[PDB]
Amino acid sequence: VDEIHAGVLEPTISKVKSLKSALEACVAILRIDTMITVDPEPPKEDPH
Amino acid sequence: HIAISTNGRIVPRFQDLSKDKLGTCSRIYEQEFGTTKDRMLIIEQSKETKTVTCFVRGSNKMIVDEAERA
Amino acid sequence: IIVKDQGNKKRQHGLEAKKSHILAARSVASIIKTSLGPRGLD
Amino acid sequence: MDKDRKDVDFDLIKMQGRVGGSISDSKLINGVILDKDFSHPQMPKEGSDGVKLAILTCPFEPPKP
Ligand SMILES: Nc1ncnc2c1ncn2[C@@H]1O[C@@H](COP(=O)(O)OP(=O)(O)O)[C@@H](O)[C@H]1O
Fold it and tell me: What residue's CA is closest to ligand 1, atom 16?
C-alpha cells in the first residue's frame, strides 16, 4: 500500500546518517585481517 | 600556538591587560549541530598568519585515531 | 693456503645463537607483510 | 615554509578530532580551533560579534597572596 497515503513517514536525515555510518563501520572491519589482543595487568601473585 | 594563531600576545598579571594584546578577529563560533551534539569552539578570522588547524571526524573513535594517523 | 689440520671451533653456541634472532626477527617482519601497498589491510 | 625555502620542518599544525560523524565531515579551519568549551551558563558565550581575544594569564580569584 502507498505509504504516503498513510501516516507513515521517516525524516530523510534518518535514512541518510544511518545508511552512511552503517557503511564506515562495515568498511573499518573489512580492512581487518589480524587482531592482536594482549593480556591486561595480572595481580602480583608473587611467589616471593 | 594559541598566540601566533590569534595574533594576540600573552597577558601576565592584571595591570598590563592592555588593548595591545587584543587578538583582532571577526567572529567566534560555538556549534553543537551534527552528530554528536558535542560542540567545538571555532575562531575566524585572524589577521595574522602562520597557523593552520583541522578538525577530524569519524565514528567509533577508531576512525579518528586513524584518520589522524593517516 | 688451507689444509686438513686446522682447527675446530672453540664454541658453537655463537653459530646457533645467531641463527636464532634471524628467525625471531623474521617472524615479526613476516606477519606484518600484509599491510604494504594499496591492497594491504589493518 | 612557503617563500621560506626548503628546511627541516616541525609540525605546529594542530589536528583535533570530534568522535561525531564520518571521515569526510572533517575539514580545514580558516583560523584556530580549541578543544575547551565555552564558559556555558556557569556563568551566563559565543561569539561576541566582531571579536577581540585575550591570552589572560595567572589567577583571577579574590586577591590572595
Ligand atoms: N599505486 C600503487 N600501486 C601499488 N603499490 C603502491 C602504489 N603506491 C604506493 N604503493 C606501495 O605502498 C607504499 C608503502 O607504504 P608503507 O608506508 O610502507 O605502508 P602502507 O602501504 O600501509 O602505507 C609504496 O612505497 C609502495 O611500495
Answer: C36
What experimental approach yielded this model? X-ray
Is residue B18 classed as helix, strand or coil in its secondary structure? coil
Distance from CA of C38 to the nearest CA of A (A): 11
Interchain pair A31, C34: CB under 8 A? no
- Residues D15 and B53: their CA atoms lie apart, in Å, by 6
Paired strand residues for B28:
B43
Q: How far apart (Å, rounded) are the C-alpha atoms in residues D56 and B25?
A: 16
Note the resolution in Å, 1 decimal: 3.8
Q: What gap in Å lies between CA A27 and CA C36, rounded to an integer?
A: 18
Rounded CA-CA distance A17/D58 in Å is: 44
In the chain, the amino acid numbered A21 is S
Using the CB atoms, write b or e for C11-42: b if 16+ within 10 Å. eeeeeeeeeeeeeeeeeeeeeeeeeeeeeeee
Q: Which of B38, B15, B40, B22 is nearest to B30 (CA)?
A: B40
Whether C and A touch, i.e. at least 3 CB pairs below 8 A, reads as yes
- C36 vs A: CB within 8 A: no
The closest of B34, C18, C20 to D27, measured between CA atoms, is B34
Nearest Cα to C32, choosing from A14, A34, D60?
A: A34
User: Given an 8 Å threshold on Cβ–Cβ distance, is D23 in contact with A21?
Assistant: no
Mutation choice for ligand 1 from C36, C39, C42, CB with most ligand atoms inside 8 A: C36
